Design an enzyme around this catalytic site. Structure first.
Site, short mmCIF file in Angstrom:
data_model
loop_
_atom_site.label_atom_id
_atom_site.label_comp_id
_atom_site.label_asym_id
_atom_site.label_seq_id
_atom_site.Cartn_x
_atom_site.Cartn_y
_atom_site.Cartn_z
N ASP A 73 0.85 -1.21 0.00
CA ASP A 73 0.00 0.00 0.00
C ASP A 73 0.88 1.25 0.00
O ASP A 73 0.75 2.01 0.91
CB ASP A 73 -0.98 -0.03 1.18
N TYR B 116 -6.52 -2.80 12.78
CA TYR B 116 -7.45 -1.76 12.23
C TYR B 116 -8.92 -2.23 12.37
O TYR B 116 -9.75 -2.06 11.42
CB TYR B 116 -6.99 -1.37 10.82
N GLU C 156 0.97 -0.46 14.05
CA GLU C 156 0.03 0.10 13.05
C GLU C 156 -1.40 0.16 13.62
O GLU C 156 -2.05 -0.89 13.81
CB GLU C 156 0.02 -0.76 11.79
N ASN D 224 7.13 -7.14 6.84
CA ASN D 224 5.83 -6.55 7.24
C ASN D 224 4.70 -7.35 6.62
O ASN D 224 4.61 -7.41 5.40
CB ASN D 224 5.73 -5.07 6.85
N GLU D 225 3.89 -7.98 7.46
CA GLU D 225 2.54 -8.50 7.14
C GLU D 225 2.64 -9.65 6.14
O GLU D 225 1.87 -9.71 5.17
CB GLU D 225 1.67 -7.36 6.58
N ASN E 249 -0.13 -5.18 13.70
CA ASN E 249 -0.81 -4.16 12.88
C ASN E 249 -2.30 -4.42 13.01
O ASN E 249 -2.73 -5.49 12.58
CB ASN E 249 -0.31 -4.24 11.43
N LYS F 257 -4.51 8.06 6.11
CA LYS F 257 -4.39 7.69 7.53
C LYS F 257 -3.42 8.60 8.26
O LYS F 257 -3.19 8.37 9.45
CB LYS F 257 -3.97 6.22 7.65
N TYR G 52 -11.64 -1.58 8.44
CA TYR G 52 -11.83 -2.60 7.36
C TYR G 52 -12.86 -3.61 7.84
O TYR G 52 -13.49 -4.22 7.00
CB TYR G 52 -10.48 -3.23 6.96
N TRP H 177 -0.36 4.71 12.64
CA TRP H 177 -0.32 4.65 11.16
C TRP H 177 -1.16 5.80 10.64
O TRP H 177 -2.35 5.83 10.90
CB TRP H 177 -0.80 3.31 10.61
#
Ligand SMILES: O=C(O)[C@H]1[C@@H](O)[C@H](O)[C@H](O)[C@@H](O)[C@@H]1O
Ligand SMILES: O=C(O)[C@H]1[C@@H](O)[C@H](O)[C@H](O)[C@@H](O)[C@@H]1O
Lengths: 592, 599
Positions: free
Chosen positions: A163, A462, A498, A406-407, A460, A562, A466, A543
């Protein structure tokens, strides 16, 4: 492999090549065949180095280009460099560079975010102008860090899984520098600190083609210890430790003497230890609480290009808001940033470019870990990216942890088999710092397969964005539940690396609903309340520091929104919320 | 004083001192008394050079500071420079700088926007580190260019009053460097490029100052010698010359060699072969009428203020090229010379302006109590006029050889109603012509000094009018504005029969404010109002140009007139286009290059 940061000494000069270069696309891909490096680039235009090429021209066809581009300039070798070892150095070429000096190929690098250099002594003459040509390639495949897929339509279109916009070019300083023909080629320091903090030891190891002596000097330039040979230990009574929020530095001056030549290299050293004990992150044997940001290298016009004003202004904003730390999301940052963090005592999680190891975020092959995607050669390329990062940053006291990715998707078969060797090799390359692998939300406490291989849990999250969209009450329940299940499963320190929601600056709502400034404040506040109720949470990195460019799509309103700040560095309401929480707590101490 | 642009040559090296410096305010003004230059600055922080100091820190107390600030760094003299003439150069320090090398005072300069330098050979040792300290002052008074008044409040706190519509940014805005010459060196060069009427022959005069015998080689863009000469002065003949033309900018290179018995120096000067002249109401380049399109600009960007920056210069030139702009004016101060190197190379036509804005106590822009007589001992006086002459000399000494520079503007929008105005400006007009007889001069004209009111425009060659009918007056009324505008341009044509350039026309436009009523501050009004100006320009035969105010939104002093700054940009400060950018793109790319449009 040996990569010392060039610095001016009595025995070392530097000439920056930054400025305007000649620039050319190669849509026909005929520049290697036609040997473009043997001539002035034809049909070229002026470009700024350093800078992404993509946004300099206000031109979509250049911004969206996939393939080779060509940079070139002429430069005069200083007359006085006769007899000296002359090195040509690129701090970063995104993602691939090949370099020619006149008609001689001198170096080549894959990896958009760490330095490369060659000794060009034999291919230049002091007092003469030389032609430097760089072929820069911005294409990603399954063996690049990060990965991608180039689709050809007849016309190249780059697919990628992360992203942030796939900016490319010469992002960082280019320079010539000198050493004597005897030179300090490498230094490792290891900084041990007694528990009582009242004594410290400094191990050194040096590579050089001559006899080695070292002097440790304090901030006042007083010699506190001396040694001899390629390796040893300096003892330091009542040491001024490198502390978060201060960052006291010593200088280790390394001399390599031959009978005829001599070289002096000053290395900044911060005396600090880092260790995980249970669910606490200890710096100098004291628990630390991380506050601050995930960042990006992103700005108007220059893309990911380094810029001193931006570094000064952004550090002034992080200082003001009370941030004590950041992570180099999602690639190694300009080394200047780590020199800054060293000097001001900013705590850094240093990350590789290995984002995108994940086919399930918002064509693509069936198995993520397979011959046709992340394979043996990918794992080799990832090892190389870890080696290059540690080789550059191993001595920065500001760096307290390595993030090797990352992720990644850790559900599929082969994830653990891919990551185990990477975790082990990272610890051998630098035993002095804990390691992490930053964790994607859907690889939850009950799902993830690799977190036991790492020292710190960097999550991370959110919830309320989402999923549980706009519902703080449900998001709060799910979040607390998941953090406690992680504490139960691994009993590691947890850093939330994040948390953020898209926020359109100037969008105001009495309903506190998604995209509004008021939602950003309510949602960060709910996260904070949960973090403070969970004893394993030792940090929070919002983030993101600022709005940044992404690939075009229906989820991104001119990019990622963000940010706490706009891309032009103006604060949203949530900057004042963080200012109060982070300046209102005790420095480096979990709020209550 | 001689001011060649440093360039790397077989005989000349440069070392940029750009980067992070140490920085300190001096709120108590004790830094000269305590000789801060003798050690490390005490309570310092990192600052980027080049850059304005004001916006680097997100700190109102620094942004709004008036007085001295202190810059410092350490630097190594290259070992190989032993025996070389070593010069320390600041391309620009806004507004005043004093420089020390260790404890030796080496330089001082007043004037925020042109270079200063000193021979530092005697004060450094090749292979050793030296300390450079700069005391930078940002205060304006009636003898600075531009002028201002420092108001000291009852508590001794300084606040800068000033009369111009851009923020009084200060600091080291442009590159700092050490450079070498040999102890024999080319110190100065003037070229004049003459061009036959038929354009089929040209002559190139040269004059050189150097402590050695002088030879020249003129080389074409392929590096082929087209002409050679000898002596400190003379004329090179050029058969079938490749003229420097707007939109192309073909450049030759005049290589100047100074040879002593022992050492020598080579300086390459880029030369564009072009003539400029006014005949009647036509501005002629290479004997052909030119029509100016483009902008009034500013040196202004987020975070860096007026600091120079290559990415900004590349991006902005790509926006001017796209929109079809052929020209700009350095409103309201000399710009970074890199801009004029760019203009030379791409054939962009430039009106080069001094920093003499603000000579006007009857505008609403800028910012205590203003003096009653603008031209008096207690305001613009004899010493002001001297300071203005010095600013014109320094600009011309820097820019005299740039073929892109087609005209000198010696000031922007002075109040010319009083008798003092002509007494102050006449000698300035005459001295500018003596300094460079090869270019026409202007003094940009304020709207209230109309054709029936103005007292000095006859002393100049080109009429540069700044006009905003339908904005500050006839507010929102295009119909009345159009009548008043046309009437005044024709009255100017009748009065002076000079070429007229509209050097300012624009309206505040908030990006994203849209209206069906086409009313002030909307994107739609910006479009309708520029369109009305264009229609009027095209009906007046004397109008040879149009420069939109302004290229981009820019910072100002806080006040009731300025919504976070000046919003007359075609682009936002972050370089995003307003609807009016597409209007200009169609008019300027739809006309024939350099040719007055038609109805
Ligand atoms: O979507 C977002 O705003 C972020 C993305 O920018 C980030 O790279 C990931 O590590 C996480 C979030 O998904
Ligand atoms: O007010 C304005 O927007 C402009 C100003 O910015 C400019 O400097 C002047 O030359 C004229 C106008 O007054």
């Amino acid at each position: 492999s040996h990569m010392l940061r060039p610095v001016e000494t009595p025995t070392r000069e530097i000439k920056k090549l930054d400025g305007l270069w000649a620039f050319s696309l190669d849509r026909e891909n005929c520049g290697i065949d036609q040997r473009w490096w043997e001539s002035a680039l034809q049909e070229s235009r002026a470009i700024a180095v350093p800078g992404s090429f993509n946004d300099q021209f206000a031109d979509a066809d250049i911004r969206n280009y996939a393939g080779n581009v060509w940079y070139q300039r002429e430069v005069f070798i200083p007359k006085g460099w006769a007899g000296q070892r002359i090195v040509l150095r690129f701090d970063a070429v995104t993602h691939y560079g090949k370099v020619w000096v006149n008609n001689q190929e001198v170096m080549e690098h894959q990896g958009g975010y760490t330095p490369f250099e060659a000794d060009v002594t034999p291919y230049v003459i002091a007092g003469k102008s030389v032609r430097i040509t760089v072929c820069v390639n911005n294409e990603l495949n399954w063996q690049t860090i990060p990965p991608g897929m180039v689709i050809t339509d007849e016309k190249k279109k780059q697919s990628y899984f992360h992203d942030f916009f796939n900016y490319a070019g010469i992002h960082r300083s280019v320079m010539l520098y000198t050493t004597p023909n005897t030179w300090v080629d490498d230094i490792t320091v290891v900084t041990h600190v007694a528990q009582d903090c009242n004594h410290a030891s400094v191990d050194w190891q040096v590579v050089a083609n001559g006899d080695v002596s070292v002097e440790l000097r304090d901030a006042d330039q007083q010699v506190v210890a001396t040694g001899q040979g390629t390796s040893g230990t300096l003892q330091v009574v009542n040491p001024h430790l490198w502390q978060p929020g201060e960052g006291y530095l010593y200088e280790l001056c390394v001399t390599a003497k031959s009978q005829t030549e001599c070289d002096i290299y000053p290395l900044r050293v911060g005396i600090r230890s880092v260790a995980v004990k249970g669910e606490q992150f200890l710096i100098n044997h004291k628990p630390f609480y991380f506050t601050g940001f995930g960042r990006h290298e992103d700005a108007d016009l220059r893309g990911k290009g380094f810029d001193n004003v931006l570094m000064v202004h952004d550090h002034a904003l992080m200082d003001w808001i009370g941030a004590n730390s950041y992570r180099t999301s999602h690639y190694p940052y300009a080394e200047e940033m780590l020199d800054w963090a060293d000097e001001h005592g900013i705590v850094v999680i240093d990350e590789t470019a290995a984002v995108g190891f994940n086919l399930s975020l918002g064509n693509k092959p069936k198995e993520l870990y397979s011959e046709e995607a992340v394979n043996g050669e990918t794992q080799q390329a990832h090892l190389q990216a870890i080696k290059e990062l540690i080789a550059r940053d191993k001595n920065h006291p500001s760096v307290v942890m390595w993030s090797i990715a990352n992720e990644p998707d850790t559900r599929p078969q082969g994830a653990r088999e891919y990551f185990a060797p990477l975790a082990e090799a990272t610890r051998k390359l630098d035993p002095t710092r804990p390691i992490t692998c930053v964790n994607v939300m859907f690889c939850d406490a009950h799902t993830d397969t690799i977190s036991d291989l790492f020292d710190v849990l960097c999550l991370n999250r959110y919830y309320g964005w989402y999923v549980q969209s706009g519902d703080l009450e449900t998001a709060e329940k799910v979040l607390e539940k998941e953090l406690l299940a992680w504490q139960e499963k691994l009993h590691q320190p947890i850093i939330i690396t994040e948390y953020g929601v898209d926020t359109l600056a100037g969008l105001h709502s009495m309903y506190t609903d998604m995209w509004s400034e008021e939602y950003q404040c309510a949602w960060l506040d709910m996260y904070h309340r949960v973090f403070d109720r969970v004893s394993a949470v030792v940090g929070e990195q919002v983030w993101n520091f600022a709005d940044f460019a992404t690939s075009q799509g229906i989820l991104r309103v001119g990019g990622n929104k963000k940010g706490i700040f706009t891309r032009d560095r103006k604060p949203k309401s949530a900057a004042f919320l963080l200012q109060k929480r982070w300046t209102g707590m005790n420095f480096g101490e979990k709020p209550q």
